[PDB]
Each structure stands twice: as C-alpha cells, then as structure tokens.
C-alpha cells in the first residue's frame, strides 16, 4: 500500500507515536517519507547482506527475521514479511522498540539526514487528526 501523507499521519497518531518518546507526529511522517516515500511494500539489501523492509526500513540484521541474515538477531520477535502489510501495526510495534533503545530516532539515517533539524511539522500540516 502507498500512503498518502495525511492518511499515514492519521494512522500513526492512532498507533500512539504522536509524542512518543518525545518526537512529535511530523518526525515519524519525515522519516518514512524518505526512508520508503510512503510505500509498505518497500525493500532495499545493504552491503552486510541485512535488508531493510517496509514503510520505516526496519533491518533485519537487528530487528526481525528474514531467514537469510547469518548471525542476525530478531528483537521485534516477527519474520520481516510482516513488515510490508498494508496494516503498519507490527511495523509501528517495533519501531517503538528501536526507538527506546538508547538511540532515539537517530536509528533511521534519512530521518538524521532529512528531517533532523528540519520544520517537520509541515508534514503534518492541513490534515485532519
Ligand atoms: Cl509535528
Ligand atoms: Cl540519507
Ligand atoms: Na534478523
């Protein structure tokens, strides 16, 4: 699924991550924006052989099980296809947990390199939440 921009803000403020851990609604907007431009479906390899899935390119060298990352951990405890349904549930679920983990979001590089610092309150502006 493609999400449009106040359509996933909506989603996400009903998930609980308006606010979470102290980033407002229009960091995690940014964050997908550029890590997946809105897309559940998106997938991309990295140079380890880890991968990365879905609407905020969760890794799978850390956070979830795709079968074919040696040595890999599964923190969120779910096979990475789960990643890339339409229903962002269990991708918000472990984004949550990487966010708690002493690194804040600062885990997604585009969001450290494109929203970090940045008004990211006009990606939520004119929607209906
Ligand atoms: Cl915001
Ligand atoms: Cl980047
Ligand atoms: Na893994």
Redo the contacts with the bound molecule.
């Keep these: 699924k493609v999400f449009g921009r106040c359509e996933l803000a909506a989603a996400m403020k009903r998930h609980g991550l308006?606010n979470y851990r102290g980033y407002?609604?229009?960091?995690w907007?940014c964050a997908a924006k550029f890590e997946s431009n809105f897309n559940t479906q998106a997938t991309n390899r990295n140079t380890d052989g880890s991968t990365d899935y879905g609407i905020l390119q969760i890794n799978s060298r850390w956070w979830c099980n795709d079968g074919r990352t040696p040595g890999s951990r599964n923190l969120c405890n779910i096979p990475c296809s789960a990643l890339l349904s339409s229903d962002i549930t269990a991708s918000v679920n472990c984004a949550k947990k990487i966010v708690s983990d002493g690194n804040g979001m600062n885990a997604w590089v585009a969001w450290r390199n494109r929203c970090k610092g940045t008004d990211?309150?006009?990606?939520?502006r004119g929607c209906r939440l």
């Design positions: 308006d407002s609604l229009g960091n907007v990211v309150q006009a990606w939520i």
